[PDB]
Design a protein around this ligand. Structure first.
Ligand SMILES: N[C@@H](CCC(=O)N[C@@H](CS[C@@H]1c2ccccc2-c2ccccc2[C@H]1O)C(=O)NCC(=O)O)C(=O)O
Ligand SMILES: N[C@@H](CCC(=O)N[C@@H](CS[C@@H]1c2ccccc2-c2ccccc2[C@H]1O)C(=O)NCC(=O)O)C(=O)O
Lengths: 217, 217
């Protein structure tokens, strides 16, 4: 089977775990453990980081026979191509490309805050910016069922993750945006997704590693 | 013509300006200026941020007829598709996807050091990690002329930029990797590139904004 490697946290790998499930992919995971403070030992991963034949060793990685990939977006893309979940027109490609990158930005902004030792006093200032972030996603999606247009694409997997993440962070952040709540419901509604959510493999939290100030256990 | 908007710095937009030239694109740029310390006014941009009709307003943006795009990677892919500068086989597509994402990682690493108040103290430790990063690009490229394979693709513009930036940061960083120095000279050798580098439009430095600790003027 295919081998997915990542930490034993949701981190940025949720869309991949979801995509593997949605596609009926035959895979096994290697969930690396991180030690507690103050050392935060990474040896389970460091012991093999340089022994897997990866070009640019990192987590996550996907081993698919002879093919070894790193970089989360590259992995999503690989699986999208294999299962025809890319945009089919130029307009769908452009929307998927923008979303792909936008999600990373919003992910980085959350990480910046969550790893700040000043988290508690920085928070109020971050909360302030949430409404604007959601509004842009809300207006982008508009009345479409999916982010690229009329059919699910890999970018829905990314968008779901980051919307879910913000909603965990600030549970009232989607109240003003019905289409976003609807989207989350629609996604969770997909048969293979609904099935996975009830499985032993499902890992919703923690989001971050033990070093974080929030969702770190 | 097409319109490219960004700051009047190199920042992360070098690969797009080079691609616009390489492709003989009919473009104009709007280079916004930031004021000086202590407030470093961003008003030239902020006054029009929400009036351009962008889905997710940001810099850079590219207006191309009826298309309005943001997210530097999405601009790069849009132009790659436009001009047939994408990978043509599955192997080339994987290589380009890995490289695009890996360049952004190495880019972020540089930006984090350069905006750190403790730059001077951090520098030393940062220089020690260069060789390892350079070796991965060197081993990845190997004997190929270009990063994806036999043909120039948009990822070569990305890789050019990050290898060039690192080489500016540490002039000896490519000594032990002739294939990388070879690539820089090959890229620079493309006719439209060489012409552009002698022109009034070329902007090689500053890389960062006024706020940075390095290459800020
Ligand atoms: N751009 C690359 C990302 C390469 C990368 O940095 N990987 C991390 C893990 S990913 C990390 C993380 C670790 C635990 C918990 C959460 C995160 C996370 C969450 C959101 C956004 C970024 C992060 C990140 O801070 C890693 O552990 N690397 C192994 C190593 O260096 O030996 C990608 O998209 O794939
Ligand atoms: N992922 C997105 C990135 C969207 C984004 O952050 N844009 C910055 C300009 S880019 C910025 C920068 C500003 C000045 C000088 C240098 C940089 C820079 C250089 C290298 C790497 C990252 C950077 C960044 O620190 C900005 O000014 N945005 C307008 C705004 O927020 O209203 C992309 O890839 O396009």
């Amino acid at each position: 089977p295919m081998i997915l490697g990542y930490w034993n946290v949701r981190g940025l790998v949720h869309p991949i775990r979801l995509l593997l499930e949605y596609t009926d992919s035959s895979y096994e995971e290697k969930r690396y453990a991180m030690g507690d403070a103050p050392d935060y030992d990474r040896s389970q991963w460091l012991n093999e980081k340089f022994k897997l034949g990866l070009d640019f060793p990192n987590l996550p990685y996907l081993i698919d026979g002879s093919r070894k990939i790193t970089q989360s977006n590259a992995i999503m893309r690989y699986l999208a191509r294999k299962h025809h979940l890319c945009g089919e027109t130029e307009e769908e490609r452009i929307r998927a490309d923008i979303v792909e990158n936008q999600v990373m930005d919003n992910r980085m902004q959350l990480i910046m805050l969550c790893y700040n030792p000043d988290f508690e006093k920085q928070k109020p200032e971050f909360l302030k910016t949430i409404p604007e972030k959601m509004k842009l996603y809300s207006e982008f999606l508009g009345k479409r069922p999916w982010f690229a247009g009329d059919k699910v694409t890999y970018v829905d997997f990314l968008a779901y993750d980051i919307l879910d993440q913000y909603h965990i962070f600030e549970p009232k952040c989607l109240d003003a945006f019905p289409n976003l709540k609807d989207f989350l419901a629609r996604f969770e509604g997909l048969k293979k997704i609904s099935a996975y959510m009830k499985s032993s493999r499902y890992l919703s939290t923690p989001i971050f590693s033990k070093l974080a100030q929030w969702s770190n256990k």
